[PDB]
Curated annotation (Swiss-Prot):
<dbReference type="GO" id="GO:0004725">
    <property type="term" value="F:protein tyrosine phosphatase activity"/>
</dbReference>
<comment type="similarity">
    <text>Belongs to the protein-tyrosine phosphatase family. Atypical dual-specificity phosphatase Siw14-like subfamily.</text>
</comment>
<dbReference type="GO" id="GO:0052848">
    <property type="term" value="F:inositol-3,5-bisdiphosphate-2,3,4,6-tetrakisphosphate 5-diphosphatase activity"/>
</dbReference>
<keyword id="KW-0378">Hydrolase</keyword>
<comment type="subunit">
    <text>Homodimer and homohexamer; behaves as a monomer in solution.</text>
</comment>
<protein>
    <recommendedName>
        <fullName>Inositol diphosphatase DSP1</fullName>
        <ecNumber>3.6.1.52</ecNumber>
    </recommendedName>
</protein>
<dbReference type="GO" id="GO:0052845">
    <property type="term" value="F:inositol-5-diphosphate-1,2,3,4,6-pentakisphosphate diphosphatase activity"/>
</dbReference>
<dbReference type="GO" id="GO:0052847">
    <property type="term" value="F:inositol-1,5-bisdiphosphate-2,3,4,6-tetrakisphosphate 5-diphosphatase activity"/>
</dbReference>
<feature type="region of interest" description="WPD loop important for active site topology">
    <location>
        <begin position="64"/>
        <end position="76"/>
    </location>
</feature>
<feature type="active site" description="Phosphocysteine intermediate">
    <location>
        <position position="100"/>
    </location>
</feature>
<feature type="site" description="Transition state stabilizer">
    <location>
        <position position="106"/>
    </location>
</feature>
<comment type="function">
    <text>Cleaves the beta-phosphate at the 5-position of soluble inositol pyrophosphates. Has highest activity on 5-diphosphoinositol 1,2,3,4,6-pentakisphosphate (5-InsP(7)), 1,5-bis-diphosphoinositol 2,3,4,6-tetrakisphosphate (1,5-InsP(8)) and 3,5-InsP(8), but has weak activity against 1-diphosphoinositol 2,3,4,5,6-pentakisphosphate (1-InsP(7)). Dephosphorylates the phosphoinositides PI(3,4,5)P3, PI(3,5)P2, but not PI(3)P, PI(3,4)P2 or PI(4,5)P2. Possesses phosphotyrosine phosphatase activity in vitro, and can hydrolyze para-nitrophenyl phosphate, O-methylfluorescein phosphate, polyphosphate and ATP.</text>
</comment>
<feature type="binding site">
    <location>
        <position position="79"/>
    </location>
    <ligand>
        <name>1D-myo-inositol hexakisphosphate</name>
    </ligand>
</feature>
<dbReference type="GO" id="GO:0106211">
    <property type="term" value="F:inositol-5-diphosphate-1,3,4,6-tetrakisphosphate diphosphatase activity"/>
</dbReference>
<feature type="binding site">
    <location>
        <position position="76"/>
    </location>
    <ligand>
        <name>1D-myo-inositol hexakisphosphate</name>
    </ligand>
</feature>
<feature type="binding site">
    <location>
        <position position="75"/>
    </location>
    <ligand>
        <name>1D-myo-inositol hexakisphosphate</name>
    </ligand>
</feature>
<feature type="binding site">
    <location>
        <position position="80"/>
    </location>
    <ligand>
        <name>1D-myo-inositol hexakisphosphate</name>
    </ligand>
</feature>
Amino acid sequence: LHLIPPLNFSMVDNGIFRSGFPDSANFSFLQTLGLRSIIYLCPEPYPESNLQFLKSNGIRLFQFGIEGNKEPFVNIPDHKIRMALKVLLDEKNHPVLIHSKRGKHRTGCLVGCLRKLQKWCLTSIFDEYQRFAAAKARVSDQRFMEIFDVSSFSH
Ligand SMILES: O=[P-]([O-])[O-]
């Protein structure tokens, strides 16, 4: 028993995964997914370890750096989530891993906005968000999803 999925790893949909920050102990597991892309939601530069992994596996890195904030001073930037959604919705980029640091807040908001585009009721989106965020669930993340306007992605 030798494969180690990254922190808070899950399959979201066909070709879409979510996690926290992968380390070298997770690389043999991530190889089994045949990733084409990573959507990385933190502003910090990617470590050399991770860069060598992407190069060796032909994985494209999309970075939309969202600053970590604490409640009640959270300000999730709409523009970054929408740039990440544009990448996520293009099947040419699949399989894709979405990750942040913990895979709960930034990752949770992006997945919740995908669920809204997939026409899930808000209570079902919030339930999935809360399952990953657990004791760190933020009302501000769920409020962001509540008011997210799908109009410009509806097509
Ligand atoms: O690192 P994250 O849970 O936004």
